[PDB]
Structure 1
Amino acid sequence: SKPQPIAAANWDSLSELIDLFNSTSINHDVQCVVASTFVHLAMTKERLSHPKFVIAAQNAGNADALASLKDFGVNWIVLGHSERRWYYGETNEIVADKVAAAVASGFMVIACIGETLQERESGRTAVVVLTQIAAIAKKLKKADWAKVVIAYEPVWAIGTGKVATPQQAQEAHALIRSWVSSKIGADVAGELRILYGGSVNGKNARTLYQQRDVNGFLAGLKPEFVDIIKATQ
């Protein structure tokens, strides 16, 4: 069976969004995450009170900064999101180092991996994606995977004019899990949450979630997020 799903939203009125989240009864077991930028942190922190939600930082790579976040009550962090890699120049190793640092600092880490349009088109989804997570694994020890969540981000589907079928997402998630099973252990692979991190709405989320290897979502901080949460069953 599947591990606990996660519905995570990455940073519309934020205040109104939080109101909506706070008011949302979530009946099933699902860990909800709102990843904020530094500036919106204290506000999200004081406003978001739904106990099935946790707040996540993003991209912190400094030990002191990590320590401060943890002190501020932030225990989750999103790392490796597409733009960090394709725009900011965070290499597989830099992301890996951040993941390892965050884990060492007591964080739950949502580590994003994903291939570009050109990589997918040229048939290199597997080598790109697995190389990215292999870099992450190299800096972790087995026990650390308890603190790791992988988000698969079809970068290739973002502003490229391409769509992500349940089959495509399942294929990607399955190959990641198979690599984790082989290289890290089947016990780890069994517990590992692999989130689909491409643009998703209520309907397609519910369908995606039905796939064997999909354990939830990394999506937009938008009112539709409530539907993404409900989709995780």
Structure 2
Amino acid sequence: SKPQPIAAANWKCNGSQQSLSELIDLFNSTSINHDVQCVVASTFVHLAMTKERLSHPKFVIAAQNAIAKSGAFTGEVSLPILKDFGVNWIVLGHSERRAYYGETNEIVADKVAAAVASGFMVIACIGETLQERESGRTAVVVLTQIAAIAKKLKKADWAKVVIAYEAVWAIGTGKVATPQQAQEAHALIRSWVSSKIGADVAGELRILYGGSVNGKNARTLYQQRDVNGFLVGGASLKPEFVDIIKATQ
């Protein structure tokens, strides 16, 4: 048995007010009989409606991104802004931001540490591409990313840290990730944390699977020793997200 699992919805850059309203209420309707933190990471635009319309005691809201401080940064949203808005959870370092929007390992780490310092619960994303997996660089890449983050934190910080292992290599590539492959990656990350931060931090840490997660595959993913729940992409916009949460029992 395990730390409290997390079922996190990464809606990404998606939703309409009507589509999202209905999903929120489906989420509200769910009876969750176990301890699980559910999280909905909507676009910035949708944070208001979600905050107001989502009333479920097991759900919190998150941002999908931020910058560290307010000021002369047109188009961007900052941590104190989110904080003032009552958002206390945030996803940082998503593969898409690292790929498209200039988030290097250091930029992500700095954002994580800034969010940790401001009181956020952080879902810090790491993980490797297909090309990196196929060139034998899974451990090099993933451990590099997490080392970059961890050197910006101190022990106390890890209470507020969640690590999402995005198996990007396993999303839309032909390669469907087995529970074993998932487990093998999560084990790698947990051993690293044990060895580098300590076995007590490693035992408390939630490591989320953020490859392709759906209603069908979640339970058998979740059952693996070192999988503590999920950061869900496209399925999180659908009813089966409920079955993903249920799969964390």
In which range does the TM-score fall when normalised by the shorter chain? over 0.9
8 Å Cα contact 1:153-1:196 kept in structure 2: yes
- Note the C-alpha offset of 1:51: 1.1
1:105 and 2:89 correspond:
no
- Note the C-alpha offset of 1:87: 1.7
8 Å Cα contact 1:75-1:107 kept in structure 2: yes
Structure 2 SS opposite 1:220: helix
8 Å Cα contact 1:195-1:217 kept in structure 2: yes
- Note the C-alpha offset of 1:222: 2.3
- Note the C-alpha offset of 1:46: 0.6
Per-residue deviation, residues 71-129 of structure 1 (Å, max 9, x unmatched): 11110000011101112120000000000010111100000100000000111100100
Compute the TM-score of the two structures, normalised by the length of structure 1. 0.96
Partner Cα separation in structure 2 for residue 157 and residue 208 of structure 1: 13
8 Å Cα contact 1:61-1:98 kept in structure 2: no
Compute the TM-score of the two structures, normalised by the length of structure 2. 0.90
Query: Structure 1's 2 and 162: CA in aligned 2 closer, same or farther, altered over 3 A?
Result: same
Partner Cα separation in structure 2 for residue 134 and residue 70 of structure 1: 27
Per-residue deviation, residues 147-175 of structure 1 (Å, max 9, x unmatched): 00000001111222211100000000000
Structure 2 SS opposite 1:143: helix
Q: 1:36 aligns with which of 35, 42, 45?
A: 42
Partner Cα separation in structure 2 for residue 89 and residue 162 of structure 1: 27
- Note the C-alpha offset of 1:62: 7.4
Partner Cα separation in structure 1 for residue 59 and residue 247 of structure 2: 16
8 Å Cα contact 1:77-1:110 kept in structure 2: yes
Deviates further, 171-180 or 157-166: 157-166
Counting aligned pairs with the same residue, the percent is 96
Query: Structure 1's 168 and 210: CA in aligned 2 closer, same or farther, altered over 3 A?
Result: same
Query: Structure 1's 191 and 6: CA in aligned 2 closer, same or farther, altered over 3 A?
Result: same
Structure 2 spans left out of the alignment, 5+ residues: 12-17, 66-73
8 Å Cα contact 1:34-1:221 kept in structure 2: no
- Note the C-alpha offset of 1:221: 3.2
Partner Cα separation in structure 2 for residue 153 and residue 16 of structure 1: 27
Partner Cα separation in structure 2 for residue 42 and residue 28 of structure 1: 27
Per-residue deviation, residues 39-68 of structure 1 (Å, max 9, x unmatched): 0110111111101000001119979x2011
Partner Cα separation in structure 1 for residue 174 and residue 236 of structure 2: 18
Partner Cα separation in structure 2 for residue 46 and residue 199 of structure 1: 29
Structure 2 SS opposite 1:9: strand
Structure 1 spans left out of the alignment, 5+ residues: none
Query: Structure 1's 20 and 85: CA in aligned 2 closer, same or farther, altered over 3 A?
Result: same
- Note the C-alpha offset of 1:226: 0.4
Q: 2:52 aligns with which of 10, 30, 46?
A: 46
8 Å Cα contact 1:81-1:113 kept in structure 2: yes
8 Å Cα contact 1:61-1:101 kept in structure 2: no
Partner Cα separation in structure 1 for residue 236 and residue 211 of structure 2: 9
Partner Cα separation in structure 2 for residue 45 and residue 106 of structure 1: 18
The runs of at least 4 consecutive aligned structure 1 residues that moved more than 2 Å come to 60-63, 219-222
- Note the C-alpha offset of 1:13: 1.1
8 Å Cα contact 1:113-1:150 kept in structure 2: yes
Structure 1 SS opposite 2:181: helix
Partner Cα separation in structure 2 for residue 15 and residue 198 of structure 1: 26
Partner Cα separation in structure 2 for residue 151 and residue 68 of structure 1: 24
- Note the C-alpha offset of 1:177: 0.2
- Note the C-alpha offset of 1:202: 1.7
